[PDB]
Design a protein around this nucleic acid. Sequence first.
RNA 1: CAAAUUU
RNA 2: AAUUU
Length: 535
Amino acid sequence: SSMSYSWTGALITPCGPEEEKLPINPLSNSLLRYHNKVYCTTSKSASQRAKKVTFDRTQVLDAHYDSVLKDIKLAASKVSARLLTLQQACQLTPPHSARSKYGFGAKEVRSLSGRAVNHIKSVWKDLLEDPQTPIPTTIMAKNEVFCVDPAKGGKKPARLIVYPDLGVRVCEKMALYDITQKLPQAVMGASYGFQYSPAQRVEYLLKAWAEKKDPMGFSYDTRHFDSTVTERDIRTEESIYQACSLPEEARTAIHSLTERLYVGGPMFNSKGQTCGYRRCRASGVLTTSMGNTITCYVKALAACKAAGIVAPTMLVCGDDLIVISESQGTEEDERNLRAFTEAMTRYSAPPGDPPRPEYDLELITSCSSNVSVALGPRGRRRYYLTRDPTTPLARAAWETVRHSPINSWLGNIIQYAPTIWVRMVLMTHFFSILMVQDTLDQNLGGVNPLDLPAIIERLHGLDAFSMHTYSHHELTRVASALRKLGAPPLRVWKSRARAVRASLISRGGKAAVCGRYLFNWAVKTKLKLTPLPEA
RNA sequence: CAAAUUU
RNA sequence: AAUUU
Ligand SMILES: Nc1nc2c(ncn2[C@@H]2O[C@H](COP(=O)(O)OP(=O)(O)O)[C@@H](O)[C@H]2O)c(=O)[nH]1
Ligand SMILES: [Cl-]
Ligand SMILES: [Mn+2]
Ligand SMILES: [Mn+2]
Ligand SMILES: [Mn+2]
C-alpha cells in the first residue's frame, strides 16, 4: 500500500558547516595512525540514505498481533497521565535546542520569555482547534563519526532526522511527556529496556538465562526501522496512548498531533524548499523512542507467538531486542527463528541481518554491545558489558577546528571501565594526555578526572580495577580493532601504562590514587586494593 | 531532532 | 557533557 517517502528532487541541505580533519591531529596522533579511516557522515551522503529508506510497504496482521495489542491496551488503562503546564514543558527543552522559525530559541523558551510563551499558546490553540492540517517539518542529516569499513561498503550514508519547529516540540511535551514517563514501563514491565542500568541489564540477562532448563537466545534489529513504521502503526500507537486515563484536552492534542504530525507530512530542507513528503516515523518527535519501543514490542511478542518460541523473556530498547527462550532443539529453533522473521516481515519490521539462535550469552549483540566474562580478584567469574571498540576509537580521533574528543575518551572510560580496551588503551592515553597538558584538575563535561576511581567503583564495583583473563572473543576483537585503526598493540599500551602510572603515583594526591587503582593491571607486583571513602 | 542511561 | 536507540 503506502510508500515511506516521496521526493521533490530538492537536495537535503546542511544546517551549518561540516568540518574536515586537519593534516595534524595533535591529541590523537599518538593514539592511532590511520586517520584516513575516520570520517563524519556528511549531508551530501543524505541523498543515498533517502534511496535506501524509500520503499513500498505492505502489512498483514493476524490473531497473534491482534491478541497482543488487546492485552497491551488493558495494560495502558491501569495508567493515569496528566497534561504538562506550558511552562513545565518549556523547562524540559534542552539548552541548545534548535531555534524557532518564528524568531526565538531555547534561551527564551527555558527562561519563559513572553514572545516565546505567546507563540506556544497560539500553537497549542491551533492543535486544539484544527485536527487535519499537516504540520511542516525540517529534514536534516545526522553527522556521526565512524571508521571506514571497506568490507561493509566504504562509508555509511547519513541517517535522516525529521523534526517540527520548536513551538510544536514544546506542545508535544505538554500533551505527551507524562505518558512517556509512565506508559512503556506499564505496558512492557520488566521487558522495558531503558528502565535498567547496565549492571541491571546484565543481571537481567543472566537471570533470564539461568531460569531456562535449556536456554536459547537471539537478538533482532529492524532495517531502517523508522521507514518501516506505517500510518496504521502510528494510529495504533495513538489508540494505545488514548487507552489511558487522560484529560479531554490531551486527547484532542494527541489525536491532532497524531494526525497532523506523527502519521506524516511535508518536509523542507534547511534552505526552505519542499523536500519531499513522509508517511512513516519522523525521528525527531517526542514519541520517537516510546513509539519505536512499544510498537517494536507488539510485533515482536506477536512474532514470538506466531513462531512458537517457548517461555520468551524479552528486552526491548527501541527497535533492538533480545529474547531468551527455552530451546526446542537446534532443528526446531532454526525453524522458529525463520518463522519469527517472516512474522516480523509481514508486520512490516524486517531484519537487517537475519537472526540466528545462539546458546552462549557472549554471542548475542544488541544496541551495539554484548555481555562478556572475565575473572575477578578472588578468581570468581565477573560478567560485564562491552563492545567492538572500533567506533569509540574512531571517535577518539575525531579532532577538528571546532571539536575536541577528550570528552568521548572520558564518556567511554566511565561507561566501559571494566573492558580491557578502556583499561589498557583509552585510560592510558587519556591520562598520558592530561599529565603532559598538566590539566588533571580541569573539569571535563562536569566531571573531575581525579574522581574517576570513585566514580568507577560507584558504577562498576571495585572489581573493575582487578579483572583479568579476558575472553578469547574480546581479546581477538580488541587486537583486531587496534590493528584496523593503526594503533599500537596491547603490549605497547602495557609499557605506556607503566610509565603513565609511575608518573601519577609519584605525583601524589588523588593522581596517585588514580595511578594505583586505574593501572594496577599494569604491574607484576599488584597491590591490595580496598574500597573508597568517596563512594 | 527526540528520548533513555551515565555524570 | 558522554553513550545508545
Ligand atoms: N530521534 C532520533 N532517533 C534515532 C536516532 N538514532 C536512531 N534513532 C531511532 O531508532 C531507530 C532504530 O535505530 P537503528 O537500528 O540504530 O537504525 P535504523 O534501524 O537503521 O534506522 C531509528 O530508525 C530511529 O527512529 C537519532 O539520532 N535521533
Ligand atoms: Cl573474584
Ligand atoms: Mn535498526
Ligand atoms: Mn483519536
Ligand atoms: Mn537498532
